Design a protein around this nucleic acid. Structure first.
Ligand code: MG
Ligand code: MG
Ligand code: MG
Ligand code: MG
Ligand code: MG
Ligand code: MG
Ligand code: MG
Ligand code: MG
Ligand code: MG
Ligand code: MG
Ligand code: MG
Ligand code: MG
Ligand code: MG
Ligand code: MG
Ligand code: MG
Ligand code: MG
Ligand code: MG
Ligand code: MG
Ligand code: MG
Ligand code: MG
Ligand code: MG
Ligand code: MG
Ligand code: MG
Ligand code: MG
Ligand code: MG
Ligand code: MG
Ligand code: MG
Ligand code: MG
Ligand code: MG
Ligand code: MG
Ligand code: MG
Ligand code: MG
Ligand code: MG
Ligand code: MG
Ligand code: MG
Ligand code: MG
Ligand code: MG
Ligand code: MG
Ligand code: MG
Ligand code: MG
Ligand code: MG
Ligand code: MG
Ligand code: MG
Ligand code: MG
Lengths: 124, 53, 124, 210, 53, 147
RNA sequence: GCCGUCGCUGGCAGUCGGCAGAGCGAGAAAGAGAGUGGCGCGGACGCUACGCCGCGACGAGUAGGAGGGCCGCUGCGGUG
RNA sequence: UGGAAUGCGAGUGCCUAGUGGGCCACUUUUGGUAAGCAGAACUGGCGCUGCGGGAUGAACCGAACGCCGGGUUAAGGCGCC
RNA sequence: GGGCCCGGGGGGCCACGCGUCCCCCGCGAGCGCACGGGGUCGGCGGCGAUGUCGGCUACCCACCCGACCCGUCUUGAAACACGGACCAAGGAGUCUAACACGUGCGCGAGUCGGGGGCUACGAAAGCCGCCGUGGCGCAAUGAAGGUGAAGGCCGGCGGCGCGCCGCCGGCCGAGGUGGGAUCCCGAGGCCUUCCAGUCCGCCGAGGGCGCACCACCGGCCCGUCUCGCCCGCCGCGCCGG
RNA sequence: AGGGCGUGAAACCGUUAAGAGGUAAACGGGUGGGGUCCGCGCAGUCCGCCCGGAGGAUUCAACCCGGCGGCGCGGUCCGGCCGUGCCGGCGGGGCGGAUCUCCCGCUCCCGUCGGCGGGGGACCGCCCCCCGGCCGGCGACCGGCCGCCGCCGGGCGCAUU
RNA sequence: AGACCCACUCCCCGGCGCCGGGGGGCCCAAGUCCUUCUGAUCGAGGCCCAGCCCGUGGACGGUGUGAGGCCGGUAGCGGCCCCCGGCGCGCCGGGCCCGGGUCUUCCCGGAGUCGGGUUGCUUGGGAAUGCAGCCCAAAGCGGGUGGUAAACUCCAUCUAA
């Protein structure tokens, strides 16, 4: 279970960074890189990840399917979205709220998405 | 659990102290949720005392 | 001990609850149908309870069955049933003190001459 | 100095015990060496059993252990004599011999005599000259099946004669276990003095008679 | 803590060979990171060699 | 481990936790159990009454195998045989009682603590207590002596 | 005002959202109960629960005790 | 009508270090011509304790201490220092 | 003076529907200002690229108040008490055994293979089960010989004279008093137009079963003492219970 | 790195620069002045929505095709594995048992009759595998259809979006 | 030892010839490929689908960093060559002329030692565990031991010098 698995990794994980009175998690599908039960991207049956696309245009939304929990090969569904800024966010909001897929990560996913799109604009 | 080890003279799997580790399913279940008092989530910060006189 | 305390009048169909281990008692002949919740149950105690038709719970199952603990009989093992408490109290060399002394050996030669019989100095 | 309640301790460290500490860091290397000498010995005497000569049954002394049997040093001359095995020929064919041991009772004697006869029935004996068999030697067919034996030969085991449930009689129900024991202790304790009193009594009255 | 699904057996070509094995009970045993650390801590001391001046 | 011990926390504190006045001297009071009848008399009398003196006969060359006599109470008597032994006897009708041989289980004397189930049994042992035999006889059993 | 300690063995799993309805600080027991008859698709942060939040009191220290150090040093198993 | 007032949550068990040179003051007090002498009772202190005052000072008087701003005090003071 | 400042013949009221009976004689809507659950301005000004702006701390210097040199033994150290000229590196509660208590883990009336054996890291790890011998625990007590851990009720007989003891068969059964977390029942009670009476909950006088633990009183086992009457038998005893 | 040569500390010393100097020096608190440097300053922030001007496009919604995913009390869809579930089995077997019991090796006795030791079999407890029936999970454990929703790719929409 | 039965031909010694663990030596995979940093590099990037090549060899060391592939090595029931050994098979000359059961008659043991006294040391060994000096000094169904001195008496158990 998530709670059992969190009790194994809360303070012992290759993704755990403790430094400068801070703590981060570098595993995939953690929306805030936060060593938190909520935002851990491995222990839950349903997780949401947002990454920049392979080329610096658009984001990739990763969703964990329900069936293959023990089958890493086919557990994550990756969708690339390369619309305008307001349309990219609208899709993520619907991908989470309409499906009721981890609704508590809605704004974290939207906030992370806005940060990737912003970083893909030309630097000044 | 049903069958003791065959290649160890006397051994069986260690018993579980907690059968259902899904703490979120337990807490959100109807049975527990009927026994709880309503949450008290209002925050009462300190009141600056003004002199009535 | 659990069978005795669950046999008192008016404790029928009540789930015995102990925060600890339920050990088997070979001196018991007939094991009545019990419902029990414990942290641990020894391998032989488990077979006897079930073979009598009883039910063994964990504490995560007591919550889903008795969220407030209703219909429960909380029970505890003998706290003073330990060898140490035989050594606590008035020091062994004081009047009417039945405290157990700390001896490396037990026998005629080991702390029985003077102070323990009037024929040798004194007794108290 | 003693401090409140505590055991009184007498450690035996008033000599130069550090000059004579025996560490055990060679234990695994000893275990390997002992095993390697068991293997090279098993190869050396094959097909003879690796364990060694067959040992007899014996009852452990004292009242603490006489309910148990174990492997003794070697079969006794009375046992070998009753089993028709020459004592000097016994060691040559895997049988151990103990000239010291005495047979006090028949049943123990018989048990080892039968143990010998069973062993002689399992013995596969290779002829002295392989091409020239002789009278007692095993046939060539059963020499192709002769394989070395692992573990003690005919291991000795403590077997219990199970008794089934039977209806209790009135004679047994009436028996008094405690009284019988207490009276038996008294009789074996006052036997010598009672016999003395009887002797003196006869003397006292005889002088009155004569 | 009672589910024993079927585990695929894969061919050397990396594909499911169609065969299956029920998940052994040992994979449902309690996960105790502190029993492990106790046992690892004390067993790893057993292959040491002595050092002394 | 030495990292969890007082010495690490006592770095920088003069006296290392033994005081400035009394200091830590070599052997004040004597070595070992010195002073039992002297400056250490209260501790010995208070906590070890009987320590000094002699009591009882000497016995040279004691052999503890001669007095070997493990005991079992009646409340544990039926554990020496399997469970089906008891249930079969309790439910059979011919009245046949099973034989419990306590010597085979490694006991010599049978003691009386506890109560027996209402079930006839034949008990074999080297020794019995008086109350053991009565309790064994109260359920319809018999006591059998072995040498 | 701020730091820490102690206490309240205080509060938060209720993030219960369009399969929706936001409360339970309030002088004074126990249900914001259940019934049967007489346009938009939207709503901040949180929760390393070993975490976060609130309120009140307090804070001298040798000998000595205890706790915590994301204080520091050398080597070993993992990991980065 | 929990049978006076007032205040306060109590009880209990293990393991336990350092100490076992003390000294001072009001009052009482033994020896001594007396002593910043020797010896007691009670309480409070110094020892372990800074801080305002007694110019200075182990103990006197006031008051006991987290790092700060404002206000007011104590004992003591307000010619100049 | 007190009696909602009793009753009768200009100035402030946290008086303001009514049917009535009669003592006496359950929702109006808005809007707004604020001495109202801890500060805002929906108020402004000057200066600014080569000499000027900010930089707590930090380097040097100055001034005012404060300020005796540390470690140590000591009632008391700045002491005319001892160590210390300066700098680097080294430098002092460790390891083994035993014991006690506390804590953590495993199993649990058991538990432990530590010795032995089997089968690069590995001298590790894994296995033994007729390898658990053995240790500790499960039984105490006495110098020892030794002994060694609940009872009552019903019916019959025997001895003494309704009761007592000895002996036989059937029934129940590991004590009780006080306190005691928790648990249990439930008088009454928890509202919405109004009446009835239901389902689930919830508070509760009173009453119960009572964990651990403590205090007290009984009981049981071993040693010893006092009194006293019996029961057993292959051994009739200086016997045994 | 120049033959006792890797690095090259501290004490202590020479010199250069700056500052200062009659109550030995040093020190705490508080400012002040001066320096060394740092801001890699010197017309001063950034973000969302909205209004308006200039423009400019892989042009929006809605529809169709395909793929993927979430959920479904599909009020009770089919197929599945599947219950540390319960019932019925001529079910085919392993493990254990201080529950009972025709065959054999050795031995006492006359060719007979008994004891030890060695084997079937029955029985009971547990377990695994096979078949039928109820309820049962699939949230440590899934597939196919249908439905709803969401997302993406491709068409079409060509402009008060 | 004698008698009656029963059964026996291989066991070794000195020489001589033939046949299947140990020591020493020599050897056995694969990049110095293409760009590139450097004083020099073993560094960094690359080496098609596939994934530079070997790999039973990715221990280690050397070489101008830091190297599985440059060298030595490492792996391998790998190869070759010498020597010692062992285990077997034959011949010559030798030695032994060998055994078991039952009856009959015979024979059988360690002395200045044991044991005893006393002394000193020693031990857990206590009216004396062991050892030694001096004195006494044996026996032959005897002697020693049987953890409290001693007498009488049975047992058990060994057979010292
Ligand atoms: Mg002490
Ligand atoms: Mg201190
Ligand atoms: Mg000191
Ligand atoms: Mg200390
Ligand atoms: Mg001291
Ligand atoms: Mg010491
Ligand atoms: Mg403090
Ligand atoms: Mg002193
Ligand atoms: Mg004085
Ligand atoms: Mg004085
Ligand atoms: Mg002091
Ligand atoms: Mg104080
Ligand atoms: Mg003070
Ligand atoms: Mg003055
Ligand atoms: Mg102030
Ligand atoms: Mg002044
Ligand atoms: Mg000054
Ligand atoms: Mg000065
Ligand atoms: Mg000093
Ligand atoms: Mg002095
Ligand atoms: Mg000083
Ligand atoms: Mg001076
Ligand atoms: Mg000095
Ligand atoms: Mg000096
Ligand atoms: Mg140093
Ligand atoms: Mg202690
Ligand atoms: Mg412990
Ligand atoms: Mg090694
Ligand atoms: Mg250099
Ligand atoms: Mg160099
Ligand atoms: Mg150098
Ligand atoms: Mg140099
Ligand atoms: Mg200089
Ligand atoms: Mg100058
Ligand atoms: Mg190299
Ligand atoms: Mg490269
Ligand atoms: Mg290399
Ligand atoms: Mg390479
Ligand atoms: Mg090579
Ligand atoms: Mg090699
Ligand atoms: Mg001899
Ligand atoms: Mg000597
Ligand atoms: Mg000595
Ligand atoms: Mg004797």
């Amino acid at each position: 279970s998530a709670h059992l698995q969190w009790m194994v990794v809360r303070n012992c994980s290759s993704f755990l960074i403790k430094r400068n009175k801070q703590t981060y998690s570098t595993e995939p599908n953690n929306l805030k890189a936060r060593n938190s039960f909520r935002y851990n991207g491995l222990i839950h049956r349903k997780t949401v990840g947002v990454e920049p696309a392979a080329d610096g245009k658009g984001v990739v939304v990763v969703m964990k399917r329900r069936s293959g929990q023990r089958k890493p090969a086919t557990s994550y569904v990756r969708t690339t979205i390369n619309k305008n800024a307001r349309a990219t966010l609208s899709s993520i909001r619907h991908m989470i709220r309409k499906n009721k897929y981890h609704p508590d990560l809605r704004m974290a996913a939207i906030r992370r998405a806005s940060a990737i799109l912003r970083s893909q604009k030309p630097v000044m | 659990w049903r069958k003791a080890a065959s290649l160890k003279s006397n051994y069986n799997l260690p018993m579980h102290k907690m059968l259902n580790t899904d703490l979120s399913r337990i807490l959100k279940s109807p049975e527990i949720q009927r026994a709880l008092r309503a949450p008290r989530k209002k925050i009462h910060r300190r009141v600056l005392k003004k002199n009535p006189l | 001990r659990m069978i005795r305390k669950m046999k008192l009048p008016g404790r029928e169909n009540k789930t015995a609850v102990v925060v600890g281990t339920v050990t088997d008692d070979v001196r018991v002949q007939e094991v009545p149908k019990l419902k029990v919740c414990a942290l641990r149950v020894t391998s032989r105690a488990r077979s006897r309870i079930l073979k009598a038709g009883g039910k063994i719970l964990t504490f995560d199952q007591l919550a889903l069955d008795s969220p407030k603990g209703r219909g429960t009989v909380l029970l505890s093992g003998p706290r003073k049933g330990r060898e140490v408490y035989r050594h606590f109290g008035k020091a062994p060399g004081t009047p009417h003190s039945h405290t157990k002394p700390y001896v490396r050996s037990k026998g005629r030669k080991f702390e029985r001459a003077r102070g323990r019989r009037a024929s040798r100095g004194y007794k108290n | 100095a003693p401090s409140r309640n505590g055991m009184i301790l007498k450690p035996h460290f008033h000599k130069d015990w550090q000059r004579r500490v025996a560490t055990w860091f060679n234990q695994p290397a000893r275990k390997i060496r002992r095993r390697k000498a068991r293997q090279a010995r098993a190869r050396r005497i094959a097909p003879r059993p690796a364990a060694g000569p067959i040992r007899p049954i014996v009852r452990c002394p004292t009242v603490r252990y006489h309910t148990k049997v174990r492997a003794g040093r070697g079969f006794s001359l009375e046992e070998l004599r009753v089993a028709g095995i020459h004592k000097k020929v016994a060691r040559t064919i895997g049988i151990s011999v103990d000239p010291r041991r005495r047979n006090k009772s028949t049943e123990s004697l018989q048990a080892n005599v039968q143990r010998l006869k069973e062993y002689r029935s399992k013995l596969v004996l290779f002829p002295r000259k392989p091409s020239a068999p002789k009278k007692g030697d095993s046939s060539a067919e059963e020499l192709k099946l002769a394989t070395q034996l692992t573990g003690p030969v005919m291991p000795i085991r403590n077997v219990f004669k199970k008794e089934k449930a039977r209806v209790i009689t009135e004679e047994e129900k009436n028996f008094k276990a405690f009284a019988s024991l207490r009276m038996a202790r008294a009789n074996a304790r006052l036997f010598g003095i009672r016999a003395k009193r009887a002797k003196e009594a006869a003397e006292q009255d005889v002088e009155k008679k004569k | 803590a009672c589910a024993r699904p079927l585990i695929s057996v894969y061919s050397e070509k990396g594909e499911s060979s169609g065969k299956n094995v029920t998940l052994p009970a040992v994979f449902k045993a309690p996960i105790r990171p502190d029993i492990v650390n106790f046992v690892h801590t004390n067993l790893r001391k057993n292959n040491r060699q002595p050092y002394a001046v | 481990p030495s990292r969890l011990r007082k010495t690490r926390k006592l770095r920088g504190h003069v006296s290392h936790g033994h005081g400035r006045i009394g200091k830590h001297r070599k052997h004040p009071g004597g070595r070992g159990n010195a002073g039992g009848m002297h400056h250490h008399r209260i501790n010995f009398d208070k906590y070890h009454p009987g320590y000094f003196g002699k009591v009882g006969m000497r016995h040279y060359h004691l052999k503890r195998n001669q007095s070997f006599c493990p005991t079992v109470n009646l409340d544990k008597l039926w554990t020496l045989v399997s469970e089906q032994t008891r249930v079969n006897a309790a439910k059979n009708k011919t009245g046949a009682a099973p034989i419990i041989d306590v010597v085979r289980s490694g006991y010599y004397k049978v003691l009386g603590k506890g109560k027996l189930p209402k079930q006839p049994v034949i008990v074999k042992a080297k020794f019995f207590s008086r109350r053991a035999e009565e309790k064994i006889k109260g359920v319809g059993g018999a006591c059998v002596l072995v040498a």
